[PDB]
Amino acid sequence: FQGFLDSSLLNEEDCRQMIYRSEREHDARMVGVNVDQHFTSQYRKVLTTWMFCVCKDLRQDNNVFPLAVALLDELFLSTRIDRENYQSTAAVALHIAGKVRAYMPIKATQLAYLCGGATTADKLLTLEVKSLDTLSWVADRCLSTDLICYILHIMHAPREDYLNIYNLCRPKIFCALCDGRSAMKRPVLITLACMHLTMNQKYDYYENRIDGVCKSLYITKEELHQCCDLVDIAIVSFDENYFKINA
């Protein structure tokens, strides 16, 4: 992704279709089993901060980690995983996300190595087939990062704004993803929350259109503001070395 390539011909309705698609993906990923338990768990903290450092180290496309997280969650909520295979699942989610968004391929042998133990590429690949079968071989999602741009379009923002905005929202979204209390929230809400945190009372088109946008998406002013606080909590409690300290 070199920004929001090939998006000039989009009209509000197209952007809405995309939002509706993340709404559905959120649902499919939410009608899971023990939803809250997974997001509040301590193992989810280790798994996401691990994948996060791995992505930073291997210097991966910035949309790999976001997807890897959306995919790890559906896999944990849509199937029964044994504690022994948690780390391995986190690696598969990472491996599959790369096949979708990565420029530089993410290697299984390298991931097996980072996993350590009895983990091998052969095992991760056998686990990837079983995982993709779960996801019906449809691995890409509409992420909160991706939504940031569909929302700026709908608000007829100037081209020049997107960049600065995308870059301010990205870090907040990543932190939100590692916090279960904020990562279980709908994608747009997280997007709009981060956008509020960065655009509120700074851009006029934002301040003029945010109410209708929220309304068309069934979001109350209250929901937006609460989310903003969930995100700020996510940002404060984010620790890159969590998987190190506890694991």
């Binding site: 992704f1 090939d6 096949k99 979708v100 079968d133 019906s136 890409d140």
Partner: protein
Amino acid sequence: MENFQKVEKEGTYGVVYKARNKLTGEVVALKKIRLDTETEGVPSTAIREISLLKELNHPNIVKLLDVIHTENKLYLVFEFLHQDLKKFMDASALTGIPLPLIKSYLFQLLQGLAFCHSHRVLHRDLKPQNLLINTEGAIKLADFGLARAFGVPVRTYTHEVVTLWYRAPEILLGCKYYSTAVDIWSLGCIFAEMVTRRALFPGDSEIDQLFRIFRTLGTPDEVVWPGVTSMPDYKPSFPKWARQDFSKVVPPLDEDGRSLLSQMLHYDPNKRISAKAALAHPFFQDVTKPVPHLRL
């Protein structure tokens, strides 16, 4: 995986079986992909193609019916079409395609193409070989193997050098910001080729191709194309050719035809007509949907 009566059809990631349903015994096209031969498992290209097709549901885009996983194989079930545009054009070359059929085909291609660009998807390699037609007078965009979707490439050119006869000139000039217009150009060259039975830019390779276009449409400048001289691969030492009497290039074309072709062939990607826009072009004032007899 059983509801099929396979038959061969040299495919893509291996073979490509034509087959029948068991329940419905319906003709379908099967793309076979191996999951156990490559170092990283399922090819990332297959993965991207699937997610891409999953969102491209439209009557003028070959439809991905199903994805089936069996053994060490992954089967992509596509809707089945009898043949491609290249074969057709060749099975009536002297006879030419009736205007009502040419207009209908271009009309459908612009519909599928409009739908594609509305979903942030660039085909990047449109040509007669991957524009399939059936027996109900329909033509559909196929093989998004070099597509760029959501800004991410399913495959880059660097390794897959196909044919350069339909490649837009901004790609050829290394423009770093090319986009949806490149596909419109391809359609513009295909719209002409239909009409004349001959390829619009019969260029040799890479180099010639760009000149093949210059010798036909004239060497662009900053007047017709603001920013050309700044393109990565633009050369001040380029030959300054001039336009050719288009009236002599695509002769059988009526005042509307060239009116649409001339706009799909603008050097400037910013001036080039869009798919949506071309749909409302008068040349599509009286569009029917004839159905040819296929030479099968």
